[PDB]
Amino acid sequence: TFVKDIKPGLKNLNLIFIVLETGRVTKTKDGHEVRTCKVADKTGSINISVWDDVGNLIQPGDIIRLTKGYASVFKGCLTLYTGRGGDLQKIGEFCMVYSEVPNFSEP
Amino acid sequence: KSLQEQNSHDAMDSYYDYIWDVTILEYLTYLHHKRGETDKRQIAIKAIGQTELNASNPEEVLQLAAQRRKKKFLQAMAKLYF
Amino acid sequence: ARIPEFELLWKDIIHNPQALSPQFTGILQLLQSRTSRKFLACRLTPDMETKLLFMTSRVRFGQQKRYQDWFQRQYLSTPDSQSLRCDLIRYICGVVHPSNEVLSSDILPRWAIIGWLLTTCTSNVAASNAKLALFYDWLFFSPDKDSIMNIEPAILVMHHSMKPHPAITATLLDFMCRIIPNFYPPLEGHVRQGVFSSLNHIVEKRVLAHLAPLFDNPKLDKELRAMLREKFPEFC
Amino acid sequence: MPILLFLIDTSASMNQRSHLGTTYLDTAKGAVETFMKLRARDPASRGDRYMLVTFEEPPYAIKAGWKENHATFMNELKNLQAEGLTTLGQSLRTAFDLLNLNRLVTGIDNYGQGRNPFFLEPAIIITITDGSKLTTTSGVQDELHLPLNSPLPGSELTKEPFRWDQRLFALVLRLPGTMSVESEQLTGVPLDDSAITPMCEVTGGRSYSVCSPRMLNQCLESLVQKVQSGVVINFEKAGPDPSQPWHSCHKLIYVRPNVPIGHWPVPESFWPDQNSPTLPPRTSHPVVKFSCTDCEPMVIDKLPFDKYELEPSPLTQFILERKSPQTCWQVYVSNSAKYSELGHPFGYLKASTALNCVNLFVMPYNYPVLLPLLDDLFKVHKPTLKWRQSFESYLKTMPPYYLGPLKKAVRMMGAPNLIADSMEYGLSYSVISYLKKLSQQAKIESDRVIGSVGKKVVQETGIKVRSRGFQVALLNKDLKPQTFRNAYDIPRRNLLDHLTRMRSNLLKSQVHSVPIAQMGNYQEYLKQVPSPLRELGMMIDEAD
């Protein structure tokens, strides 16, 4: 189970990721705040789309797994998406070890 | 390699009288000490402690002790198997 | 002790300790006694203790910054948090007793934990309280009933902080050298006895190859090394 | 400050009896006791420290190592049980590793810096054993082989377990069972044919084959005379020899103090160079080759030189009995020169004027060329330019480690700031870091071994019962059954009597089993007891 293998068109996803970082307020379109957050591990790093509702009450460390997802791209940066059948579900908390060195968001 | 066995069908302690080589009895004493059977170790140490089996005896004395033990052991084997 | 009730009780103990309890001979038994882990442990909620156990059992050396900063900003951001730092230091020293097998491994050494705890004391009173908490076990050391875990983080901090953070090492050394006569002159001999026992415990179980370079470190001040030589000719 | 290691055989073959009525192990213990008694006659004996090793497993083989007082040694020596194999090789390796435990940490072996006879830790290993062949669990080995399965760190530098200043004297007990009086016993003690004799011969020692108590006493008298601080050097006749044993034989030189002091180290067997990653392995005994040709024993004033007296050997003294003290035989070590395979003479063997002893004088690496130059400087003189050029040419053909002792020599001589002040050590930084790491590892392993000499544990009481993990324990040795405290320790044989005793003890109304040593020690008992009113043929019979 690696972060690297989040591809478009995948089914029956059971992947595990940890939101160690916090999303930052930013403007998109006019009226909507589609926040974005990035996480990293020993395998790789990937961005996670954060909606306003989740982004207001989010605190770091939560563990969530998606099913029937479909990968998306946002201005050349890969971004996970949920909807039209997809659904999220929290599992646990704090039982992880991270590695922030392999992050691909650097210049 | 044979004394290391433990499924013996012959009276192990009783045959310790018939060993005359001191190294065989040395290995026997080590084996019994390692396995913890103190009493058979005492029998082996008593066997070593016999004056006639002292390895630095005159050669004919050792030869005669070996010969008498050989005779007794072979007679016992004859009584057992005939 | 400012409340007159405690002063009255202390004076009654001084005048006749057997008066309040016939079997209670005096303060000798209390001083020679030991503190059980239950009292140190019980003031912490389970979440903090479990986090510290996870850090000392799973977190490798280097990642300690994120978890401790999270705990500090979330909770340890109050005026009373300074004394709570001392409470956490006491909990780590008295309760947390890791095995030697995990010590041999490359798991996160406790010297980093002690360094983070000490460097966060932003006031002189907080630092004084934390140092008194650290030196509380050092007053009455007993090798037979106590583990070396109460002084291994200390000596590790001194050996590891010589180059990067001389200030912490110098402050701790100055405080532990000056606490000896100041604490209690009628019982300062016990303090020196405990320090000698701890030094002998470090010598017998050689965590470091030689203690000689640290005692007379060139970058330490003159008077500290002078009084270290004066008090303990045995380690010279 | 010598070391006396007794490698007592504890193989079960040591249970053999003799006409004395005691086992061989008993006679070995008595031999150690009598060796101590004879040793104590000398005033110098107060400085020795004894060591004990047995033929047991490695965790229990050493039972009197370093930091062990004499009483502990005696207590361990008394309670020896002969119950193992004749694992002579492994035990001998354990003994040598124990002796060489502290060498690297204190750096007494100046690796890559010549050999210093004054840096010695003199030890002899007295292995008392019977003649029976070697045994292991696999079988009989019938030839002594030292195992190297778990080398101590830095061991490859000497490539031999026994070291420069160590010797092995075997006391092979051959006491016959039935008494056999022989007039041949009046002759000298002979050499033994067992597997230990070659190993004794190579390391400078010799074996002994005792066949009677009087021969045992003679052997122990000989052993006491053979303990002496010194190192062992292998000699060899260089060039056309004058083969009898005097051509090449391991021999001892006495290193007397006044602690030991000396200046010139014996040269290495290799040419040092800073480029090599690792030093070559040096044989434990430095094979020095002597030239039979006569030469002038030169000497100059204020010269730091060392006189070492070789141990007496009969044929060497006999040939040197020819009165020739005015001449001497030079000596050099092979493969010491950068180009030549022979090397230059660093010393000579000049017998004393009285011809009582043959003394080895050690000098700089190539002395017959340097000494005229130094004499010329100290006689004529501000050295000349040609003289300094000659010195530089000499230094080009002189191994680097010699300069340090030469620097001290010129400093004490009266030329403090000669060309030696440039300073050098002449090894690789890799080698020095390796030596530092070896010192650290040696300290760690030494502390571990000193911690582990105790082994306060007994053998497992299990049986490994087979289903042809439930086991039946052995007798609870040293259990100290608390009969009063526990009711299961009361045998049915004497249930009522102990019941009555514990009942009476419980109401308002193990001792007398003190060890034998503490049984009649009236001093401690009187010291414990209050003091009274102040005061107004066989040898021992107690109470002085």
3-state secondary structure D180-237: CCCHHHHCCCCCCCCCHHHHHHHCCCCEEEECCHHHHHHHHHHHHHCCCCEEEEEEEE
Sign of CA dihedral D509, D513, D515, D516: positive
d(CA D253, CA D97): 24
User: Which one-letter DSSP state was computed for residue C67?
Assistant: H
User: Which one-letter DSSP state was computed for residue C169?
Assistant: H
Query: In chain C, whose CA is at the least distance from the CA of D450?
Result: C204
Nearest Cα of chain B lies from the Cα of D88 at a distance, in angstroms, of: 14
* CA-to-CA separations, D386 to D373, D390, D397, in angstroms, rounded: 11, 6, 17
In chain C, breaks (C-N over 2.5 A) are found after none
Q: Phi and psi of A89, rounded to 5°?
A: -160, 120
How are beta strands D288-295 and D328-333 bridged, if at all?
Answer: antiparallel
Q: Helix C46-57 vs helix C64-74: angle between axes, to the nearest 10 degrees? A: 170
Question: How many beta carbons lie within 10 A of that of residue D112, not counting itself?
Answer: 24
| D106 interface with C at CB cutoff 8 Å | no
- Residue A18, classed as helix, strand or coil, is strand
C209 and D447 in contact by Cβ < 8 A?
A: no
Using an 8 Å Cβ cutoff, are B49 and B19 in contact?
A: no
- Judging by beta carbons within 10 Å of its beta carbon (0-12, 13-18, 19+), is residue D368 exposed, middle or buried? middle
d(CA D358, CA C221): 59
d(CA D332, CA D306): 16
Phi-psi region of D204 (alpha: psi -120 to 50; beta: other; left: phi over 0): left
User: Which one-letter DSSP state was computed for residue D4?
Assistant: E
d(CA B42, CA B35): 13
Query: In chain D, whose CA is at the least distance from the CA of C204?
Result: D447
Q: How determined?
A: cryo-EM
Closest CA to D173 of D291, D308, D60, D28: D28
Contacts of C123 (CB under 8 A, 6+ apart): C82
Q: What is the largest CA-CA distance in chain C?
A: 55
d(CA B33, CA B43): 12
Using an 8 Å Cβ cutoff, are B54 and D45 in contact?
A: no
Question: How many beta carbons lie within 10 A of that of residue A97, not counting itself?
Answer: 12
Beta partners for residue D288, in sequence order: D235, D333
Beta partners for residue D169, in sequence order: D126
Contacts of D373 (CB under 8 A, 6+ apart): D387, D390, D391, D394
Q: Which residue has the tokens 């579900």?
A: A89
Distance of CA D508 to the CA centre of its chain: 62
Using an 8 Å Cβ cutoff, are C137 and C89 in contact?
A: no
d(CA B65, CA B55): 11
Closest CA to A71 of A2, A1, A13: A13
Q: In A1-107, which residue ranges form alpha helices assigned H by DSSP? A: 52-57
Using an 8 Å Cβ cutoff, are A80 and A19 in contact?
A: no
Sign of CA dihedral C58, C64, C68, C70: negative
Helix, strand, coil share of chain A (percent; to 5): 10, 35, 55
Supply angle C-alpha A8, A9, A15, rounded to 5: 75
Q: Which residue has the tokens 């105790």?
A: D454
Closest CA to D343 of D290, D411, D401, D422: D290
d(CA D449, CA D452): 5
Distance of CA C233 to the CA centre of its chain: 24
Query: In chain D, whose CA is at the least distance from the CA of B52?
Result: D177
Nearest Cα of chain D lies from the Cα of B13 at a distance, in angstroms, of: 17
What number of H helices and E strands is found in chain A? Answer: 1, 7
The token pair that represents A34 in the structure block: 């589609």
Q: What is the CA radius of gyration of chain B?
A: 13
- Judging by beta carbons within 10 Å of its beta carbon (0-12, 13-18, 19+), is residue C47 exposed, middle or buried? exposed
- Residue D78, classed as helix, strand or coil, is helix
Sign of CA dihedral D80, D83, D86, D87: negative
Q: Helix C110-119 vs helix C81-94: angle between axes, to the nearest 10 degrees? A: 160
What residues of chain D lie within 8 A of the CB of B58, using their CB? 176, 178, 180
d(CA D86, CA D130): 10
d(CA C71, CA C89): 15
d(CA D287, CA D204): 13
Burial code (b: 16+ CB inside 10 Å, e: under 16) for A5-42 equals ebeeeeeeeebebbbbeebeeeeeeeeebbbbbbbbbe
Question: How many beta carbons lie within 10 A of that of residue B69, not counting itself?
Answer: 17
Using an 8 Å Cβ cutoff, are A86 and A67 in contact?
A: yes
d(CA D192, CA C92): 66
Closest CA to D370 of D348, D349, D395, D350: D395
d(CA D293, CA D300): 22
Helix (H) or strand (E) holding D328: strand D328-333
Beta partners for residue A80, in sequence order: A48
Question: How many beta carbons lie within 10 A of that of residue C64, not counting itself?
Answer: 18
Q: Helix C166-183 vs helix C110-119: angle between axes, to the nearest 10 degrees? A: 80
The token pair that represents C207 in the structure block: 């965590």
d(CA C102, CA D489): 41
Chains contacting A (3+ CB pairs below 8 angstroms): C
Q: Could you please report the per-residue DSSP string of D271-324? A: ---SS-SSPPPPPSS--EEEEEEEE-----TT---EEEEEPP-HHHHHHHTSS-
Burial code (b: 16+ CB inside 10 Å, e: under 16) for D506-539 equals eeeeeeeeeeeeeeeeeeeeeeeeeeeeeeeeee
CA atoms lying within 13 Å on the CB side of residue D466: 4
Closest CA to D349 of D238, D215, D455, D513: D238
- With touching defined as 3 or more inter-chain CB pairs under 8 Å, the answer for chains C and B is no
Q: Which of A41, A59, A94 to mutate to test the interface with C (most CBs of C within 10 A)?
A: A94
Closest CA to A103 of A25, A20, A29: A20
Q: Which residue has the tokens 């370093």?
A: D66
Burial code (b: 16+ CB inside 10 Å, e: under 16) for C134-165 equals bbbbbbbbeeeebebbbbbbbbbbbbbbbeee
What residues of chain C lie within 8 A of the CB of A58, using their CB? none
Q: What is the CA radius of gyration of chain D?
A: 30
C206 and D440 in contact by Cβ < 8 A?
A: no
* CA-to-CA separations, D312 to D148, D226, D290, D307, in angstroms, rounded: 34, 11, 17, 15
What residues of chain A lie within 8 A of the CB of C66, using their CB? 20, 98
d(CA D305, CA A70): 90
Q: In D381-416, which residue ranges form alpha helices assigned H by DSSP? A: 385-396, 403-413
Contacts of D134 (CB under 8 A, 6+ apart): D86, D87, D88, D89, D140, D141, D142, D143, D144, D195
- Across the interface, of B28, B54, B61, the residue whose CB is closest to D17 is B54
